[PDB]
């Protein structure tokens, strides 16, 4: 499972031995560690490896962290409330929670942390730099990244930025330049199969053979988090007894997207467009991002065998176009619906 | 089972009105000696340590932990007070005229840090009102107050944008008024810097005591001492 | 220690009087006739950046009152606050009183009025004409679409034509007399072409070129010095790149572009501008060649304005030029 | 201060301290160095690619001009971290510009040439609003005798036309392996990095127009080599494995898949590729290099593939999905 | 070098409170005679001119004529940070740099050394107070403040008319109109309440009320304000100090 079964060090990560060796090489000399930016697919263990690196450079007491609340004030009297995951050796921030106020929190909080120093009793003040983790750095606005551009170079002896992100493209070139770029490839089917096997031997799950683990690995597309979360759900659905004939439990939103793809392929009509608009509204209202919605819809429309090469080419072209549009817009549906319309124009 | 009594609510209201602004969740230890409160801020810059003597009725069978919010505490205290709690104190009762106020306890990851009396290169004491006025006057210029203790002279400077302030004071002792006295003991010329927003909040504790002690060391945090005892461990800026 | 020589050449050679403002002869003559005859209507100077608007208005304020103009003239620039409350109180009070220093018509200089809110302009629309026999208004602008039509109609419109070549040669000669220096004719022509009407860039790059000679009293500023100081591509390398792209094949054209842009550290944004400026003179025997040649190159320029890549956009420019130059054959 | 610099990473450790340390732009450093003996310094506008020396050369110039004593009291520095707005530009920038220059001490007046003006450096002025830059116009023109303005940016287009006109422009050239290999050799010699014969060329080629990225890459490679303790040199593939460069064999497999294959095969291979963590920008750049450099294709294909790669890069530079864009680009290049 | 040590502390405070919300940037010109300064309004309508000799200072030493410009808001910020029991000492170095204000207590050693960074103002010193005023008068400051802030409630403009041995303040507005007519008279048992007037030609001219409401704020310094009026000339509102004088030159409104 994702919880209670997780490597809390570098000698425990049982996949991507090359990345573990590189992280050990980086952790060899802690006081000379530059800023790091981890990129790769989702559910790859980037945060786990980052916490393992932190535990490797600092003491083993970095995992006992606590959530604190911070109040900030914008230009107006609008008060904003954020949370910080602080440990005796570092602090974690997810600036994505603010809509368009990432610059304020970034600048004020980072300057406040960089000016003062860390404390003792973990010999009165002497300690090394305090790490600041930035989770989901892609959602940072361009102005927030601009404000962050100078904070790294100005105060480097106190603040080291370890930023986790996926699909590194929405990161400005200066920020891409001023930190190391580390990649985390998804684990192969064999290593993730061993990860699932260790879980099912520790949790005492009743399986017939190892084929089900390989099926789970092939269905999770490489996301270790999804793999563990689906293995647990499948164990719960079959009463801790895994069989060779077990339905792969697809999350609800993927099932809705598949139904929408079937509806698109079958009926290419304006009323069908209104119904798909209703489904898209109902999906977006339950906090599902439009980018991943478009991605899954495109990769499901490309999977139906009823369309030939030309339809798939036009679909992927319209998908790239409308994804670029979505990356430059605020009203999400206004683009998604449009994309669907173009698909309806492509098939017939 | 803990049960303590104050003859007047003023002694407990002024202290909380003093230290309610910086910290919000503080852990209190109750034992035979007195109440020992400890808290660390969110950014780990200022550690607050409060010591309340039992002479200010007291009854505690064993030393216990507790945690209570100061916002609602000042809200209800806007007449003697009695604070009581039973075994496994999931609720603390405050009896005030007869009244009862039950407050719930919050779980705090309060790692008990030791309070040791190390050696300090400089230790001085100056009236609270004068220090609060100096801080409130220097904070208008800059946002970083530098304290420099050299050759039997104390110096509070602040280099701002519109100009620069520099208050130089010498130790003075008076007989006709014992409250206006400035004592100093120095072993090494020191010069540190601190944030003005922290001192702007600390100076509100001027109603707690008539004098304030400033203890400064080379690599150790600054100590702001109010005699109920209350000590602030403030962290400086490294250097530039 | 602050002397007159402690100013950059942009401000060191600011025209003191109207006689030292070149180029805008048609406007300056009529302005001098205005001040001589005694009727100075509400003026609206509209011009590109670096043409002489502010210098002309300060020279006029000096010639009207005297060597102490800031004493009685009120100057509101973009640095000050120009809200509706400002127009209500400050400008309206200055317009409705007499002078403290002299006895004459007051002058309100509203510099960069295009940065004013529509509400402030609407409020000023009435105060500009309610007090006319006592004060006059000068509105300086670079964009004439920010000003409301009402405010724009109440002022005599004077457009500051970009500095023609003759005026810039005159000013360069004046500077080279006031500064021990020598300038080659071809280098002067290159500077004229690089100016693009801007009178400030001329003086800026002239000082920068005087700084890179190691002796400014004997060595003359050659065309190479001017082209190197700003990093602009010389016409020779530009023509060579264009010829290699048009005639030679893909590999050698890419190699030539890379070797030219890496010999002096050029930029694609300047190569594109030079290429379009030299290509707009060709006699294309159709209308669809120019369409693609402009569309693709403008798209590449817009993409460069975001700093995407540096090696993909060069091949993009090469392919765009080649595909455009295919309808001719 | 030497121990703090030694502990600092190589980026800050080897930051240029004088105007002779920046061995990148001999066209813009000489103009500033000759300003020392002179007194006329124009409003500077340093613009160029990320990581070329602007923020370092301005600090080096201010130091060499004023000295570490007068440096704190003679220059104001407004970076993107500070709150730069119309109100701030109107109040604080004008207040500091409309100020009297600080009195230079005898030490500074004797050692360093103290000019009779302060310096306001607005770093990363491409993040300012248009109204702020508009208000800056007369602020940077009236108090020109006691204050100068240095703007720094990556996009000269983002700065309004009046500010670009008034400021003296300085384009910072990109740093390739021809005019920047000396600095990397100096770093490798000062840090005992046992490099290969031509690995620094590959390092500077990977970081296209960037020296800070190359320095960080060299530091990380030296650390990864010293971790094992083997003592052998650092080869080129050892560097480009961690630099994000995709191995040449995988690129050849991609070219073989796109040269012949239907939509489904390319889609499956792109899914398998994106399973691994590869920056789509690097893959597009390597594809462009391999295709344009090659001579086995005709010009009618080269023009179309160049335009396609340009379109894909322009799409990727807007923070879009790398998987979808890469799949679309591969399908498009396959359609040819 | 320049050392100006005052006799008291609140003297400079009361002197600066005259132009609290009246003007922003001032430039004190310090010579051997004393401190002379002038400041033009933000709308360039009224000009404040203050002169304080070596009479108000406890100690005065000025080697060469210096000129120190400063913003009034920062000056008031610095002045409010000093207790009214210490002494105020203006200290300036050889070259004009940030002016040094010094607060020294007379019983306990409390040295408050504030530095105020000077502003670089285009000090275009003119030559005023050298023009002949066709009408002059002098009246108690309390009565003038009463008249001004009573007529300011009925309109925004106030017309002052000096006729043959009569002063007239007229306020014409929307809700109504007011007119105060005073006559010159000199009392012997109370010489401070006397109203003096010397007129050569009849005068009629208007002013704004928003500026008179700020001019009357200077009535906290003296008790007898003088008013000099002339056609085609600024109005001189002078308050006489024990050492110098504080005078406002107000520009009259233009009538149609
Ligand atoms: N017609 C001109 N004759 C001579 N010098 C000129 C002329 N126009 C500009 N200059 C020079 O350029 C400098 C700046 O010109 P300005 O008139 O201040 O620019 P501007 O008209 O205000 O345009 P803006 O306001 O920046 S858009 C002057 O100080 C001169 O040195
Ligand atoms: N010209 C140069 N000479 C020597 N080292 C350089 C040079 N340019 C960059 N570096 C190195 O790269 C580091 C960063 O340089 P910067 O000056 O911050 O780059 P940059 O131009 O500021 O990039 P930005 O700010 O993101 S546009 C320096 O500390 C040096 O170690
Ligand atoms: N080497 C490993 N062994 C076992 N589990 C792992 C390993 N690496 C990652 N995981 C599991 O993956 C889960 C989610 O990883 P996460 O940090 O969310 O990845 P990402 O940072 O890419 O989102 C964790 O709960 C962890 O249990
Ligand atoms: Mg102008
Ligand atoms: Mg920089």
GROMACS .gro file of N, CA, C and O in nm, chain A residues 29 98 106 112 121 149 201 203 215 218 234 251 274 304 312 324 342 344:
model
   72
   29UNK      N    1   2.826   1.486   0.002
   29UNK     CA    2   2.865   1.614   0.061
   29UNK      C    3   2.742   1.702   0.078
   29UNK      O    4   2.697   1.765  -0.020
   98UNK      N    5  -0.319   2.902  -0.374
   98UNK     CA    6  -0.362   3.036  -0.413
   98UNK      C    7  -0.390   3.041  -0.562
   98UNK      O    8  -0.316   2.984  -0.643
  106UNK      N    9   0.507   3.340  -0.194
  106UNK     CA   10   0.644   3.305  -0.227
  106UNK      C   11   0.741   3.409  -0.171
  106UNK      O   12   0.826   3.378  -0.087
  112UNK      N   13   1.121   3.570   0.466
  112UNK     CA   14   1.115   3.554   0.611
  112UNK      C   15   1.197   3.434   0.656
  112UNK      O   16   1.261   3.437   0.762
  121UNK      N   17   1.897   2.270   1.995
  121UNK     CA   18   1.825   2.179   2.085
  121UNK      C   19   1.737   2.082   2.007
  121UNK      O   20   1.615   2.081   2.024
  149UNK      N   21   1.296   3.382  -0.894
  149UNK     CA   22   1.422   3.378  -0.970
  149UNK      C   23   1.539   3.432  -0.889
  149UNK      O   24   1.647   3.372  -0.886
  201UNK      N   25   0.275  -1.008   0.036
  201UNK     CA   26   0.331  -1.101   0.134
  201UNK      C   27   0.328  -1.042   0.275
  201UNK      O   28   0.311  -1.116   0.372
  203UNK      N   29   0.097  -0.802   0.376
  203UNK     CA   30  -0.043  -0.788   0.413
  203UNK      C   31  -0.118  -0.921   0.413
  203UNK      O   32  -0.236  -0.923   0.450
  215UNK      N   33  -0.070  -0.791  -1.451
  215UNK     CA   34  -0.186  -0.723  -1.507
  215UNK      C   35  -0.208  -0.588  -1.441
  215UNK      O   36  -0.237  -0.488  -1.508
  218UNK      N   37   0.056  -0.352  -1.576
  218UNK     CA   38   0.024  -0.308  -1.711
  218UNK      C   39  -0.095  -0.213  -1.715
  218UNK      O   40  -0.102  -0.127  -1.804
  234UNK      N   41  -0.859  -0.383  -0.504
  234UNK     CA   42  -0.895  -0.513  -0.559
  234UNK      C   43  -0.896  -0.619  -0.451
  234UNK      O   44  -0.978  -0.712  -0.454
  251UNK      N   45  -1.093   0.391  -1.183
  251UNK     CA   46  -1.151   0.505  -1.112
  251UNK      C   47  -1.272   0.561  -1.186
  251UNK      O   48  -1.287   0.546  -1.308
  274UNK      N   49  -2.442   1.875  -2.670
  274UNK     CA   50  -2.499   1.932  -2.548
  274UNK      C   51  -2.485   1.833  -2.432
  274UNK      O   52  -2.453   1.871  -2.319
  304UNK      N   53  -0.998   0.365  -2.979
  304UNK     CA   54  -1.107   0.294  -3.045
  304UNK      C   55  -1.062   0.249  -3.184
  304UNK      O   56  -1.004   0.328  -3.260
  312UNK      N   57  -0.742   0.968  -3.652
  312UNK     CA   58  -0.655   0.978  -3.535
  312UNK      C   59  -0.558   1.094  -3.549
  312UNK      O   60  -0.529   1.163  -3.450
  324UNK      N   61  -0.294   2.360  -2.608
  324UNK     CA   62  -0.226   2.490  -2.607
  324UNK      C   63  -0.323   2.601  -2.571
  324UNK      O   64  -0.289   2.694  -2.496
  342UNK      N   65  -1.461   1.992  -3.258
  342UNK     CA   66  -1.369   1.962  -3.368
  342UNK      C   67  -1.360   1.812  -3.393
  342UNK      O   68  -1.358   1.769  -3.509
  344UNK      N   69  -1.599   1.606  -3.340
  344UNK     CA   70  -1.724   1.575  -3.408
  344UNK      C   71  -1.719   1.618  -3.554
  344UNK      O   72  -1.787   1.561  -3.639
   0.00000   0.00000   0.00000
